[PDB]
């Protein structure tokens, strides 16, 4: 289900998309896929919205079985983009579209890549071919008010605020990860290992964590503990009936103990209009890998492109 806001029913294809400053306001926008609509408008000359009637909870995932999507509060890359935690970059030509997802008819798809996050949009009136590589005309998208059907998120991914690590420990992890995957030559066009000869690229479903340096750390064997840190980001605030609280209202709730809430929120922030509650999510994920513990920015199991030693 949704985090705060029930799915959007839009009318004005041409309605502006406001920059809302409250955190719960931004989560509300994320619930209604307004961030992805914003993305399409900005990058691929698209009028209107995606997410009609379904919102974020009806988005399409590759793989279709999504563990992290059953947790309404786990942040997808796109969600993280809207919260300024990372950038889902507009695809360049050299960005690789992985095979396997049912791209046909999609209007937007994103995937974690080895060195970032890439998103692919189609203009107004167009959608993707099966290969994902071309935007061709589609009369079913004429409405400009398109169902969540048309949004594709690749990967079992959770993003979250990160405890930045020094370059030293990133280099150690990058090296550890190189020795775990000695036969990988490049991932998503990035040199992973030095290779003399190299296979044709092929899909690669790999576990990875983003620890905020030049590229991700793909992992063979790792352990994950989820910890509920009950920080302010873990709570959303809403007025009864009328959706999310104001930026100002949310702030005083989370800093002054003057609003109503559920039992965890009252414990950490205080309680005596707005109500704040725990978002449904397992917590922040801590990764043990390379004999290190680390709080990554994103964590996931996603498809990328790899070549192998020949």
């Amino acid at each position, epitope marked *: 289900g949704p985090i705060i806001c029930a799915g959007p029913i839009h009318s004005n294809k041409s309605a502006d998309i406001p920059h809302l400053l409250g955190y719960s306001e931004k989560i509300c926008q994320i619930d209604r896929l307004i961030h992805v609509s914003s993305w399409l408008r900005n990058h691929s000359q698209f009028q209107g919205y995606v997410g009609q009637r379904g919102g974020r909870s009806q988005v399409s995932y590759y793989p279709a079985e999504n563990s992290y999507s059953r947790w309404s509060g786990l942040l997808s890359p796109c969600d993280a983009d809207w919260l300024g935690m990372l950038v889902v970059k507009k695809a360049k030509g050299s960005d690789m579209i992985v095979p396997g997802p049912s791209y046909k008819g999609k209007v937007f798809f994103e995937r974690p890549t080895f060195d970032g996050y890439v998103g692919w949009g189609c203009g107004s009136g167009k959608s993707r*071919t099966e*290969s994902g*590589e*071309l935007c061709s005309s589609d009369s079913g998208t004429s409405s400009g008010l398109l169902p969540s059907d048309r949004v594709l998120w690749i990967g079992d991914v959770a993003c979250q605020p990160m405890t930045p690590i020094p370059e030293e420990t990133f280099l150690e992890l990058k090296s550890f990860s190189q020795s775990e995957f000695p036969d990988i030559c490049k991932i998503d*066009g990035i040199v992973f290992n030095q290779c003399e000869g190299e296979s*044709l690229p092929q899909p690669f479903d790999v576990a990875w964590m983003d620890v905020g340096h030049s590229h991700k750390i793909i992992m063979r064997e790792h352990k994950t503990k989820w910890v509920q840190e009950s920080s302010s980001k873990d709570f959303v605030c809403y007025k009864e009936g009328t959706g999310p609280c104001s930026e100002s209202e949310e702030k005083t709730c989370k800093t002054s103990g003057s609003c109503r809430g559920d039992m965890q929120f009252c414990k950490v922030a205080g309680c005596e209009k707005c109500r704040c509650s725990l978002v449904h999510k397992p917590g922040e994920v801590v990764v043990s890998y390379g004999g290190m513990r680390v709080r990554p920015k994103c964590y996931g199991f996603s498809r990328m492109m790899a070549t192998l030693e020949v």
Partner: nanobody, 115 residues
């Protein structure tokens, strides 16, 4: 080493036809996914047609060229083709042949359409 050699570009009057070939070395196109790009001067590299082994051999075309260009392969000959019919001035470009997800590009062949 992978090699891609293109052929078949040239001068053609509007309405004319050309067949572009891409002979490949160092992989078998019967498993590869192949793409045809074109690059006009000033404009950006635009993807024009695909043959996707990942899709069982299916074929996909950009909207501008749909219905005039035809991509196909000769597995025996390890060669992929782009048949271009009813050529327009806007088809003038250098055409490139590329292996999907790789920096394997053909030399490029020049297609010029003019009356």
């Amino acid at each position: 080493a992978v090699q891609l050699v293109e052929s078949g570009g040239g001068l053609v009057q509007p309405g004319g036809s050309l067949r572009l070939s891409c002979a490949a070395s160092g992989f078998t196109i019967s498993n590869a996914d192949m793409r045809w790009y074109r690059q006009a001067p000033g404009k950006e590299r635009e993807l024009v047609a695909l043959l996707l082994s990942s899709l069982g051999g299916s074929t996909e075309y950009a909207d501008s060229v749909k219905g005039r260009f035809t991509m196909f392969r000769d597995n025996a000959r390890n060669t992929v083709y782009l048949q271009m019919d009813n050529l327009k001035a806007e088809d003038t470009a250098v055409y490139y042949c590329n292996v999907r997800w790789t920096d394997y590009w053909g030399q490029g062949t020049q297609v010029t359409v003019s009356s």
